[PDB]
């Protein structure tokens, strides 16, 4: 064996004597002679000479193993050192640099890597190419938590990648790994108890049962089976939160009730006996919601479908409700019915579906007949936040909502497919009115009703702030693992989905689906794989 | 480490002690320990065996660490060593030959690389193939600003490049790296404020913001959004300066003022009211321009369209003005109109555009009604150089002007596409009379002007002289980035800009663009690259 000392390595053990006796410095030990797995990143054919694919500091969470001992002392000291593995072909060309910038130079367009002490990395070598990063620090020692300036590894693009065949491949893993070098050390123990990486990197709010097992929407309490693409972007905003501690709507993640107290009731006809009960209330009047005033918590957010007569109305949202009066209220015995919610204008006249929640007012219209029906000024509903589908016959009419049914809000941060990725759409098996006995089998399609995230996405997105988390410009990604194929699934700053599947409308089924792995953000210039068993 | 002393090293370094005592020479040094980069160049499919494709002289501008020691030494000394590092393919086959030609042999197609003391250079090699320079003088040192003869070294092609996939990619990038020898030194140290290369190499001319930001046309003050290819060619000599000290026209580079004095004015109908002032003076008669007599400066130089009535003319050259009286004139109040400027022959009666500017005369037709019309003798225009486009109705025209609406005085040097590489035209946003508000959103694609070259470009190039700086025969290379591809674009002698986009008219945006980088001169044999995100 043979480990790699740095150039620095008498004055970098010398000064850090600042921290008292140097631990975990003893050179016999294997988890300091064996290189480990830290990222990896994709270099494309698209990518200019010059270009910046892979940028990391010096930090003890470039290795596996220090990052598991620097919970455990708060300060560090010495090198490292990194291989690089390309996967690459011989039928692949260009090369590669990576060097070590000093502190005080800031990274990006104008660095120019070609003129620093590099190594070339060939696009089809065999035996990896290993840099050796020394510590130029101007402290002593990096206590963990505030480690100051440290130096930057940067690997540049030397010569393009060319593909002599065309188009398919057109992309190489470059996988990066890492060993401590002979003059690093820890220094200063600490309880483990304190901790410095709070974000939850933002890997761990997606594991792998979420999508095969637990989890569900943000319009129904339904397992996630489907993921189905969508060209031209959509937008949703109710249950979605973004990476920092906000979201733009009602509605907090949570299936429990929604609960109105003030609105107008009527009913069609001269004969109060078998009619329709339609209920109306404004926008922004929900003084009882304190998140934002212009809905109920778990009004849904797509636009009414008008309709009259016994008809059953195309698609939807229904759902079982009831209609209390108010000065503590019981509620009428006589008027339990399905009701269906949404947006409507010109009530209770001429009714039209509404795209902007503001101009618009709420609406409520049982699709069955009941036998009394109040007009009084003040009443409210009473409905479940879970619901389902209403439709005339069984058959399969699309999944809902389609990406213009749904009213957004003002000041809404809209899907948008960036190159070849576009914007995924989860869908889950939910059950209809002209078919209750919706199992997944025979019997024409099953109705699949999409939504944006799921809702453990949404629960560990909420109490937490990733204003660093995940750098703009990028998407962190996951590795999904199926039977006969994997996808790289993004997710943005604007809390969306994104798959490479480029334009083309197909359900791909999360049945085959085994593991979700962490591999860490990647910009948006980088398409994610589409290798399926197609 | 072992770094390669040369052949004549111990008569190197005694022979260079009249310039005293050697200078910068330690051999731990790591600026003398490492390669770094100093060019690359293209080696197509379409090269012969024989074919020279990099020479290059012995002087210390070879390296970037030296030419940086260059400026604080007035003198060096001692060898050179040089690395190819080539991108290729396992698939690609050729060799290449390097060689260091003594002088006194001059290096051209009669030269024969192969029987000189050489190294063979694989395309698909993965080491790089190292040989070193040797300084070969008849001088004891090289001083700097006059270092006499030195040894060239050139690459020829050994064996021809063949790719067995058939077209697509006929072009591999090689990479030369430079380091110092063992006996290279500098004498004689010098104030840095003496310089020597003072070409702004033809590359600071043209920076990063000059696209994506700062920087306008040669029409137009407007900024660079566009840059659009013209199979055939055109030609444009207003702004538009050559690399050597002169320029083949009128308007220097600056949107100021367009004052001319001697004119005589007309205009039709019987009655002086609400009619269209319409006037002319012959080409050669403007005595005020100091740089030529044919037009003031900033006249616009396109053929004049003819149009009567009260239709407004289809695209053009529109900008609001006023005609002034002579013998220290005040201009008439009554006459401020938007004024359309241009060449056209037989004026008042039968109007024709005129392609040539001699044997024509310059025009100025009013386009809106005037209260006032004077037919005096005397007369001027007062117009600012900043104009717009008329057009009848909004929509969208074409890109103004064609190739061949521009006039072109006797003696132009007109752009040629040679090889794949076509001319560039780099459009702007301009604002219309039909639609004002032409902010670059909907409601119909807006208006593109499009001229030579950038405004930072023609300014750069006035002061200085390039007759050394670009060889004839090649032209100057920059590296765009883009966000998911990169060109390369040219700037051969005649001031034109050029791209290896073919026979294509597509706009292409720099919205993504990143950065510029200088490289150097390249031949025209070699086709610039369109790796672009398609």
Redesign the interface.
Known sequence: TSVVTAENSSASIATAGIGGPPQQVDQQETWRTNFYYNDVFTWS???????ILYTVQHSPQNNPFTAVLSQMYAGWAGGMQFRFIVAGS??????LVAAVIPPGIEIG??L?V??F??V?I?A??LEPVTITMPDLRPNMYHPTGDPGLVPTLVLSV???L?????GSTSAIQVTVETRPSEDFEFVMIRAPSSKTVDSISPAGLLTTPVLTGVGNDNRWNGQIVGLQPVPGGFSTCNRHWNLNGSTYGWSSPRFADIDHRRGSASYPGNNATNVLQFWYANAGSAIDNPISQVAPDGFPDMSFVPFNGPGIPAAGWVGFGAIWNSNSGAPNVTTVQAYELGFATGAPGNLQPTTNTSGSQTVAKSIYAVVTGTAQNPAGLFVMASGVISTPSANAITYTPQPDRIVTTPGTPAAAPV?KNTPIMFASVVRRTGDVNATAGSANGTQYGTGSQPLPVTIGLSLNNYSSALMPGQFFVWQLTFASGFMEIGLSVDGYFYAGTGASTTLIDLTELIDVRPVGPRPS?STLVFNLGG
Chains 1, 2 share one sequence.
């Open positions: 054919v698209a990518d200019a000479p010059g270009s011989g039928v692949f060309g260009g090369r367009p104008g120019e070609r003129q002490p590099h070339v060939d089809r070598s030397y010569n393009n060319i593909n002599p065949f065309g190159g210039k």
